[PDB]
Design a binder for this molecule. Structure first.
Ligand code: NA
Length: 440
């Protein structure tokens, strides 16, 4: 197939590190979600604002308008019309750019976690653009704003080939839908990002082991509505819920840091399933790749290095990768070790900063994955989207595409929730299907 050598030309047995894909590290995960939101919009429209506050824009806008008019009554009214900043934001979500202040090419106030999340979403937005999301006063305000907007250029984020292409499609549809509804964009863009950040990390964890199968698809992760007791014995929740997520989450840092070893310098990063595929299609008569991996693995498990059980070299590429991923995990076994502590911090950070209110306690049943009512409404609106109406099964398939699965019982409770919310065709007529519409 190819003749591009598929992995790093020099494979160092080094300290575990990742520079890609996961948006959290073992510490320093203080996230400014409004900055992240500003960064996302900036990358969507290819503009930024440089060291210039919304406070100052507001003042400059008043001033700008009284240069054009200067009627004492008029000033007093615009003062009142735009005293509340929500009324500036409502004119255009371009105003969210003020949250992501740049200083030259640098993100002025972001933590490095903000930049990491910015990077996740920029790689869900490859080859994606928003057309800028109006009465006569508002148009003058956007005219003043356009004078402040600086072109983004390539921007500050790293390029990473999409690990989960199915979330890309969904994310881009959802951003496009929000852009058509600017008032709803303001209410929900940020929550949409928290939702995607979680689902992306969960779906990643659940697809790590599927590196043999090429391009991944949505994996069954089951959530209850936060309103449910979860007292009866539900198989899907037990087998494919929190405990499945938690088991697979334990491999994020191990597997992704190993993948980091293979990544070719001076090239866009790519996911493990792409790297494997590239290794299979590379025609090397001399088995260069297989030999390099075996050398690395054998050096990895050596006593001077990680000190792991001896094993015969891999005779093929499939078995070489499995070996790489075993040892990648094996080094974190034994609760006592220092590396097992690092992996634990990864889990706690993930659960604290990314999984907020996706997890709850349910008595003796321990932790449980939940969808709270806000997220449920957000999903409903995103999924119905540009449609007037979806059949219930159509809706659930949308939810599933985005990483959210529901058993039959949760689906009953969902429909009941929609009756109260008044966005379902259910008991009030006799129809061919259950139809769900947007609440917005
Ligand atoms: Na009915």
């Amino acid at each position: 197939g190819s003749h591009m050598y598929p992995i790093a030309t020099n494979l160092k047995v080094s300290n575990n590190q990742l520079d890609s894909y996961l948006p959290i590290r073992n510490k320093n995960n203080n996230i400014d979600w409004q900055i992240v939101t500003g960064l996302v919009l900036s990358y969507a429209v290819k503009y930024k604002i440089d060291t210039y506050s919304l406070e100052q824009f507001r003042e400059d806008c008043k001033t700008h308008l009284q240069i054009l008019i200067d009627e004492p009554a008029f000033l007093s009214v615009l003062e009142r019309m735009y005293f509340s900043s929500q009324d500036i934001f409502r004119v255009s979500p371009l105003f969210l750019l003020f949250h992501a202040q740049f200083d030259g090419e640098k993100i002025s106030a972001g933590s490095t976690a903000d930049k990491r999340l910015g990077t996740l979403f920029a790689n869900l937005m490859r080859d994606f653009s928003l057309n800028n999301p109006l009465n006569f006063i508002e148009k003058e305000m956007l005219n003043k704003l356009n004078k402040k907007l600086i072109r983004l250029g390539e921007g500050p984020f790293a390029k990473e080939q999409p690990y989960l292409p199915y979330l890309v499609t969904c994310f881009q549809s959802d951003l496009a839908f929000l852009a058509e509804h600017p008032q709803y964009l303001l209410q929900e863009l940020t929550n949409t990002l928290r939702l995607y950040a979680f689902s992306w990390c969960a779906q990643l964890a659940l697809n790590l082991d599927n590196w043999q199968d090429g391009e991944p698809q949505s994996k069954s992760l089951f959530f209850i509505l936060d309103t449910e007791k979860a007292s009866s014995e539900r198989d899907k929740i037990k087998l494919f819920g929190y405990k499945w997520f938690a088991r697979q989450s334990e491999k994020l840092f191990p597997v992704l840091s190993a993948l980091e070893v293979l990544q070719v310098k001076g090239e866009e990063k790519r996911p493990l399933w792409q790297v494997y595929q590239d290794c299979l299609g590379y025609s090397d008569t001399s088995n260069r790749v297989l030999n390099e991996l075996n050398n690395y693995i054998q050096k990895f498990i050596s006593k001077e290095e990680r000190d792991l059980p001896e094993r015969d070299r891999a005779t093929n590429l499939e078995d070489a990768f499995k070996q790489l991923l075993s040892v990648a995990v094996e080094q974190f076994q034994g609760k006592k070790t220092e590396r097992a502590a690092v992996n634990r911090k990864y889990i706690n950070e993930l659960e604290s900063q990314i999984c907020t209110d996706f997890i709850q306690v349910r008595g003796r049943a321990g932790k449980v994955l939940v969808l709270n009512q806000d997220r449920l409404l957000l999903l409903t609106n995103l999924t119905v989207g540009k449609n007037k109406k979806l059949r219930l099964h159509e809706l659930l398939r949308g939810f599933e595409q985005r990483g959210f699965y529901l058993d039959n019982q949760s689906t009953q409770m969902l429909v009941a929730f929609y009756e109260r919310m008044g966005n379902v065709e259910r008991m009030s007529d006799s129809g061919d299907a259950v139809y769900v519409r947007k609440t917005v």
